[PDB]
Amino acid sequence: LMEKLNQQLAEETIDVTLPSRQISIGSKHPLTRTVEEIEDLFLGLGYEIVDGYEVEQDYYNFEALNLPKSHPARDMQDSFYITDEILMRTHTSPVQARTMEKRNGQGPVKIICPGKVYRRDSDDATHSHQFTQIEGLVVDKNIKMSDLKGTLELVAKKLFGADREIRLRPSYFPFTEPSVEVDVSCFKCKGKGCNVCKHTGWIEILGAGMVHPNVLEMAGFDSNEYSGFAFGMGPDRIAMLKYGIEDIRYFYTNDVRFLEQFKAVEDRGE
Amino acid sequence: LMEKLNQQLAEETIDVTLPSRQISIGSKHPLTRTVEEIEDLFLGLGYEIVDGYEVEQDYYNFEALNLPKSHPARDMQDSFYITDEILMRTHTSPVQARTMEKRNGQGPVKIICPGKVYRRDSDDATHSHQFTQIEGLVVDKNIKMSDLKGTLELVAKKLFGADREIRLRPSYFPFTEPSVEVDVSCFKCKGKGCNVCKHTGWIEILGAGMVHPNVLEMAGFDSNEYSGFAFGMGPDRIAMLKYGIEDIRYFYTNDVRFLEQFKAVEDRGE
Amino acid sequence: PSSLPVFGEVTSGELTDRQHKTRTLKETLEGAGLNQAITYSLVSKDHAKDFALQERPTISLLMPMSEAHATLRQSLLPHLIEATAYNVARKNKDVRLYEIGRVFFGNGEGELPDEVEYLSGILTGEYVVNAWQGKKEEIDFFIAKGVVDRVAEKLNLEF
Amino acid sequence: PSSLPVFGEVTSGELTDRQHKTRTLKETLEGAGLNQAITYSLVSKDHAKDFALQERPTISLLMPMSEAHATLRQSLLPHLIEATAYNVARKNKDVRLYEIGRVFFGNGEGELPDEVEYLSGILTGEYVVNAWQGKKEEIDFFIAKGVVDRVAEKLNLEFSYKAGKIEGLHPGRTAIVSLEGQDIGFIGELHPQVAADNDLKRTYVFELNYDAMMQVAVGYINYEQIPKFPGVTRDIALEVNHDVPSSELKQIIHNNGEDILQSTLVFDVYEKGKKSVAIRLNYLDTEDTLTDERVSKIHDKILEALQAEGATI
Ligand SMILES: O=C(Nc1cccc(S(=O)(=O)N2CCN(c3ccccn3)CC2)c1)Nc1nccs1
Ligand SMILES: O=C(Nc1cccc(S(=O)(=O)N2CCN(c3ccccn3)CC2)c1)Nc1nccs1
Ligand SMILES: [Zn+2]
Ligand SMILES: [Zn+2]
């Protein structure tokens, strides 16, 4: 017995070094990871997350974003139109305009709209006819561009680390005024300069600026009372930057050799 | 071939009604669910979540919470002391006092501390020598009891539904002044009255009130500058209320017939 | 100057119920070995009605850039099948994917379609493998049902 | 009146990294069939040092209400074993639990102890069952390792595993777990005596220093490019001290494969005196053009490193 159970003990010895029976983990899409990261940043600042239509009216895609029927933006050549008036959305701003109007002219508004967007273009390693945006929109009563700047700083840190700085360059979009194009300090080279940032030490990640008076007013808000800031970014681009992904199409091709690299948590590192 | 692959088709017919190969789901502890729910409410309001020691110094457990060495609270009979000066913590407030002091007298402070707590008592169906608290603490510059009330309202809705109201009853705790005991409108009977709420239509879920001047000052904050509100609640009690759980010990006994009832999401219902 | 706006009407930021459930559900599908896919909304006009159960108009673009991408999608399965075909050709034999995405059904002419969010997925290969022990559990129908049962369990739904 | 305070210094509320990882990790353990346990911190003074690996003072209460609850806990396993014993007595034969909780180690007298957060769990019964199909997969050691592997995967941590001898454990089915040359825990089947004392069938536990785990900063995921052309697979067959850890093979192989060894797999074993190890090597270069000449140069330098740390074929 202290013979027999003792030599059962020994017939039962194992190499504990051998492969476990895997209990496999599926992957979260890199594009979803970036969106949720950004969801989490803004939930924590009191914002809501809004979804809208992927097929949209040209009033909300365009007219309500300060693109009158003339405007070159609305070329049938560069957007996927379905009729004269209906098309695949080109950005997530229609959702934000539809949302504002519903609020009949009372703030705050503070929303973040991620989603799929669509552009009439030929596909290669840096161009996709379907890709993703996140926009947001804050409308309140003494909203300043200093306030858009602090918000962008948090976004940039969220995405690329606590040490990031930003740079704001003047620019122009019809729906905002003033407008900015936004760079993040390069997360690879401190600020020496590198391939990643085209040896400038700055990488462009966002555009933004103050919501344009006409945009507020077409939606019912009073531009003498309320200001506004908004911004867009592209997870496809962010995640190709962050990881060195070589081909935008890799997001929509679902090679498991691509997808399955994105199982694990990440941190602020050191 | 359109014979042979066709009668392969038929040898391959199945009852699709039979039990799936389960891919079993483990359960989240009911106590963790309540804590995380409350984490999520307060993250979204800008707060941090703090953890501290379960074995604590009597200065932080007691002295710093306005319980001088005299005070009956500190009876060796009602707390698990390890030496004269060291004991199992009785509440999560030591963490919040240790936290304040570190801030040397600058706000805001807005923290939520969940954790295990300890009481020298005999165990039955409503009493546990180890149970759980969540407290929080806000310290800022024009903090009012109206502000504690709005915060409690959200807590009560978070836990028990959008329609909940609260009631505040006067009370007394040494670390706060004014103090309140807090009821939630009963989530079962509208407000007729029922077993659950002892036919009063109100159920006590929280205590709270304004942080006491001495508590602020022992921690270094200036009570002429800064006010303060704090609050506690007990997930063990909340979750026995919410679910009709019959025995507090069921949380710490880990019958899988208890644990495994808590696999699924919940909603606001209708 | 760098500032942050201070909102005077205070609301706690949280996922909606639907949003929350969707995070949770993705978690449980990932927990069971399924990779999250994202497929192209636009299919070939020939395949746009593949796997659709209600007959319903499809939505074509005035000016497609590709015959591959001419018509909206009434199912997620054509491109998930394609994606499995592609992996398998590259010797990736074990494919497990899920997607939560819109499909599109015409409300006829000049009218926005119904955009309906689907949950689908596709499975082939081994579910459980440890060769040295002689363990190989091949995906079958009841594994696939197990996935769908597990979705129903997590959501507290009776299928 | 009902109001809410408006903070003038604005900060986004978020989980810390550690907090976030812990939510995520619980999710993945629940996703794999393990129920979250919460056990009592206080044990009997007799059991307070059960499964502890460093000798270290225990912390007793001046005035316990119960002999069951007299001393802090240096392990989560006593009460998780108890809890499994209890379920099994009630005819709940399939028990799968995990806990993340503190254990307590005296820094001697008048001093606060070290409170160290552990991750442990315990498993017995079927892992996978569908009776009508004749499916029954019983929990064994490698399932238990699979759980622990899956924790390492989700967290992006590299664990190694060497045979071991512990306390309550089957001495030929126990392993120590290391992270960065530190030992941080173990996995093993319970000693057949301890099983039997508790009326338990084959049962496995694991215990890990979560504090150690959480110190590894793992950064952002390291993406590798997708190869446009195939890699090369060769299966080698070895003969060893039947007696040698597979881990030691994997280690030199992987020490010799440079740039272009992608992965390896032990896919078969046989055992008088020597064992055969079949291992499949996967060469690949997502970066540069892989060539047959580099792959044979490296292959044969592999099989030579192997021969010289003591290996036939
Ligand atoms: O104002 C915005 N968003 C916004 C602001 C600035 C920059 C960008 S961005 O970089 O992503 N952009 C995307 C679109 N691009 C366009 C589109 C059409 C014409 C010119 N350029 C410019 C770059 C988005 N939305 C609002 N919703 C409701 C009210 S205001
Ligand atoms: O002030 C608090 N919390 C607090 C406020 C009121 C009520 C409660 S409560 O209901 O959970 N409580 C728990 C403790 N109980 C006690 C404890 C000792 C003596 C009397 N009664 C009363 C009920 C908690 N903490 C702070 N940390 C730092 C600064 S202030
Ligand atoms: Zn650079
Ligand atoms: Zn009632």
Nearest in space to A33 (alpha carbons), one of D214, C35, B229? C35
Check: CB of residue A187 under 8 Å from CB of residue A212. no
Please give the structure tokens belonging to residue D294: 């580099």
Check: CB of residue A181 under 8 Å from CB of residue A166. no
- Cα–Cα distance for residue pair B20/D132, rounded to 1 Å: 10
The single residue listed with the structure tokens 């999520």 is: B40
Nearest in space to B135 (alpha carbons), one of B224, B26, B47? B47
Q: What is the resolution of this structure in A?
A: 2.2
The single residue listed with the structure tokens 């509100």 is: B229
The single residue listed with the structure tokens 């190869």 is: D227
Asked if the peptide bond before residue B108 counts as cis, ω within 30 degrees of 0, the response is yes
| Centroid of chain to Cα A132 | 7
User: CA of D235: how far to CAs of C30, D264, D266, in Å?
Assistant: 31, 9, 9
- Render A232-269 in DSSP notation, one character per residue: EE-HHHHHHHHHT---TTHHHH--HHHHTT--S-----
CA of D228 to the centre of ligand 3 (A): 27
- Cα–Cα distance for residue pair D137/D134, rounded to 1 Å: 10
For D17, left (φ over 0), alpha (ψ -120 to 50), or beta? Answer: alpha
Q: 3-class SS at B131?
A: strand
| Centroid of chain to Cα B234 | 5
Task: Spell out where B42-175 has E strands.
Answer: 48-49, 55-57, 86-88, 109-118, 130-140, 166-171
- Cα–Cα distance for residue pair D302/D307, rounded to 1 Å: 9
CATH of the domain at C47: 3.30.930.10
Task: Spell out where chain A has E strands.
Answer: 48-49, 55-57, 86-88, 109-118, 130-140, 166-171, 176-185, 202-211, 227-233
Q: For residues D189 and D311, state if they share a domain.
A: no
Count CA within 13 A, CB hemisphere, residue B236: 20
Domain housing A200: 1-270
Judge residue A165's burial from the number of C-beta atoms within 10 Å of its C-beta, 0-12 exposed, 13-18 middle, 19 or more buried.
Answer: middle
Check: CB of residue A208 under 8 Å from CB of residue A179. yes
CA of A266 to the centre of ligand 3 (A): 21
- The amino acid present at C37, given as its one-letter code, is A
Cβ–Cβ of A53/C33 closer than 8 Å?
no
- Cα–Cα distance for residue pair D60/B64, rounded to 1 Å: 25
Option in D21, D143, D187 nearest A265 (CB): D21
Cβ–Cβ of C131/D32 closer than 8 Å?
no
- Cα–Cα distance for residue pair D219/A157, rounded to 1 Å: 14
- D245 domain-assigned: yes
Please give the structure tokens belonging to residue B119: 């009481």
Check: CB of residue D299 under 8 Å from CB of residue D281. yes
| Chain C environment of D268 (Cβ under 8 Å) | 131-132
Give, as one character, the DSSP assignment of residue A26. P
The single residue listed with the structure tokens 């793992």 is: D218
Check: CB of residue B97 under 8 Å from CB of residue B60. yes
Q: CA of A196, closest CA in chain D: separation in Å?
A: 15
Task: Spell out where A124-188 has E strands.
Answer: 130-140, 166-171, 176-185
Q: For residues D68 and D177, state if they share a domain.
A: yes
For B120, left (φ over 0), alpha (ψ -120 to 50), or beta? Answer: beta
Judge residue A45's burial from the number of C-beta atoms within 10 Å of its C-beta, 0-12 exposed, 13-18 middle, 19 or more buried.
Answer: buried
Mutate to test the pocket of ligand 2, among B113, B138, B175 (most ligand atoms within 8 A of CB): B175
Check: CB of residue C41 under 8 Å from CB of residue C102. yes
**Residue nearest to ligand 1 atom 16, measured at CA:** A173
Q: How far from each other are the two terminal CA atoms of chain D, in whole angstroms?
A: 84
- How many helices (H) does chain D have, and how many strands (E)? 7, 16
Please give the structure tokens belonging to residue B80: 């698990």
CATH of the domain at A103: 3.30.930.10
| Centroid of chain to Cα D266 | 19
Q: 3-class SS at D99?
A: strand
Q: In what helix (H) or strand (E) does residue B183 lie, and over which residues does it extend?
A: strand B176-185
**Which residues, including other chains, have CB under 8 Å from residue B139's CB and lie 6 or more apart?**
B100, B107, B108, B109, B110, B211, B216, B221, B226, B227, B228
Nearest in space to A122 (alpha carbons), one of A232, A206, A242, A248? A248
- How many helices (H) does chain C have, and how many strands (E)? 3, 8
Q: In what helix (H) or strand (E) does residue C115 lie, and over which residues does it extend?
A: strand C114-124
Judge residue B9's burial from the number of C-beta atoms within 10 Å of its C-beta, 0-12 exposed, 13-18 middle, 19 or more buried.
Answer: exposed
Check: CB of residue D245 under 8 Å from CB of residue D213. no
> Domain tally for chain B?
1
CA angle A132, A133, A139 (to 5 degrees): 160
Residue list, ligand 2 pocket, CB within 6 Å: B 73, 91, 93, 96-97, 135, 137, 173-176, 207-209, 211, 215, 230-232
Q: Suggest the residue from C20, C145, C147, C159 to mutate for an interface test with chain B (most B CBs closer than 10 A).
A: C145
Beta bridge partners of A81: A87
| Chain C environment of D131 (Cβ under 8 Å) | none
- D225 domain-assigned: no
What number does the ligand 2 atom closest to the CA of B211 have? 30
Nearest in space to C28 (alpha carbons), one of C128, C133, C159, C148? C148
Q: For residues D190 and D148, state if they share a domain.
A: yes
Phi, psi of A219, deg, nearest 5: -110, -15
**Residue nearest to ligand 2 atom 16, measured at CA:** B173
- Cα–Cα distance for residue pair B110/D19, rounded to 1 Å: 17
Q: For residues D208 and D253, state if they share a domain.
A: no
Q: For residues D248 and D145, state if they share a domain.
A: no
Q: For residues D105 and D193, state if they share a domain.
A: yes
- D6 domain-assigned: no
Give, as one character, the DSSP assignment of residue B27. P
CA of B39 to the centre of ligand 2 (A): 19
| Chain C environment of A21 (Cβ under 8 Å) | 128, 130, 133, 135
Please give the structure tokens belonging to residue D248: 């030691």
Q: 3-class SS at D48?
A: coil
C17 touches A at CB < 8 Å: no
**Which residues, including other chains, have CB under 8 Å from residue D234's CB and lie 6 or more apart?**
D280, D281, D283, D299
- D132 domain-assigned: yes
Nearest in space to D30 (alpha carbons), one of C150, B240, C158? C150
Q: How many CB atoms lie within 10 A of CB D138?
A: 13
Ligand with smallest separation from the Cα of A171? 1
Q: In what helix (H) or strand (E) does residue C36 lie, and over which residues does it extend?
A: strand C35-36
User: Determination technique for this PDB entry?
Assistant: X-ray
Judge residue B258's burial from the number of C-beta atoms within 10 Å of its C-beta, 0-12 exposed, 13-18 middle, 19 or more buried.
Answer: middle
- Cα–Cα distance for residue pair A170/A181, rounded to 1 Å: 6
CA of B208 to the centre of ligand 2 (A): 7
Nearest in space to C150 (alpha carbons), one of B34, D33, B177, B261? D33
- Cα–Cα distance for residue pair B62/B74, rounded to 1 Å: 7
- Render D285-300 in DSSP notation, one character per residue: -SSS---HHHHHHHHH
Check: CB of residue D115 under 8 Å from CB of residue B55. yes
- Cα–Cα distance for residue pair B95/B89, rounded to 1 Å: 10
Residue A232 Cβ contacting ligand 1 at under 6 Å: yes
User: CA of B184: how far to CAs of B83, B195, B216, B231, in Å?
Assistant: 39, 15, 29, 14
Q: For residues D186 and D239, state if they share a domain.
A: no
CA angle D276, D281, D286 (to 5 degrees): 170
| Chain D environment of C30 (Cβ under 8 Å) | 31
Q: CA of B34, closest CA in chain D: separation in Å?
A: 14
Q: For residues D157 and D280, state if they share a domain.
A: no
- Cα–Cα distance for residue pair C84/C139, rounded to 1 Å: 14
Q: CA of C12, closest CA in chain A: separation in Å?
A: 5
- Cα–Cα distance for residue pair C59/C108, rounded to 1 Å: 9
CA of A125 to the centre of ligand 3 (A): 21
Check: CB of residue D60 under 8 Å from CB of residue D101. no
Phi, psi of A138, deg, nearest 5: -120, 125
- C133 domain-assigned: yes
Mutate to test the pocket of ligand 1, among A67, A89, A110, A135 (most ligand atoms within 8 A of CB): A135
User: CA of C82: how far to CAs of B79, B104, C100, C125, C133, in Å?
Assistant: 66, 61, 17, 16, 33
- C140 domain-assigned: yes
- Cα–Cα distance for residue pair A87/A56, rounded to 1 Å: 6
Length of chain D: 313
Q: For residues D48 and D120, state if they share a domain.
A: yes
Judge residue A67's burial from the number of C-beta atoms within 10 Å of its C-beta, 0-12 exposed, 13-18 middle, 19 or more buried.
Answer: middle
Nearest in space to B190 (alpha carbons), one of B160, B152, B220? B160
DSSP H helical segments within C6-128, as ranges?
Answer: 17-31, 77-89
Task: Spell out where chain D has E strands.
Answer: 35-36, 42-43, 59-60, 71-72, 95-105, 114-124, 126-130, 135-138, 160-163, 169-179, 182-190, 203-209, 232-237, 240-241, 261-270, 274-283
Q: How far from each other are the two terminal CA atoms of chain A, in whole angstroms?
A: 56
Chain breaks in chain B (C to N over 2.5 A) after: none
What number does the ligand 1 atom closest to the CA of A100 have? 28
Q: For residues D89 and D144, state if they share a domain.
A: yes
CA of A118 to the centre of ligand 1 (A): 14
> Domain tally for chain C?
1
Check: CB of residue B173 under 8 Å from CB of residue B207. yes
Ligand with smallest separation from the Cα of B195? 4
Q: In what helix (H) or strand (E) does residue C35 lie, and over which residues does it extend?
A: strand C35-36
Q: What is the dihedral of CA C23, C25, C26, C31, to 10 degrees?
A: 120
Chains with ≥3 Cβ pairs under 8 A against B? A, C, D
Give, as one character, the DSSP assignment of residue D125. S
Nearest in space to A233 (alpha carbons), one of A117, A127, A146? A117
- Cα–Cα distance for residue pair B51/D300, rounded to 1 Å: 54
Domain housing D121: 14-217
Please give the structure tokens belonging to residue D96: 């799968």
Residue A231 Cβ contacting ligand 1 at under 6 Å: yes
D226 touches C at CB < 8 Å: no
Nearest in space to D205 (alpha carbons), one of D161, D175, D172, D164? D175
Q: For residues D244 and D205, state if they share a domain.
A: no
- Cα–Cα distance for residue pair A166/A169, rounded to 1 Å: 10
Identify the closest residue of chain D to C147 by CA–CA distance: D31
| Chain C environment of A76 (Cβ under 8 Å) | 62-63
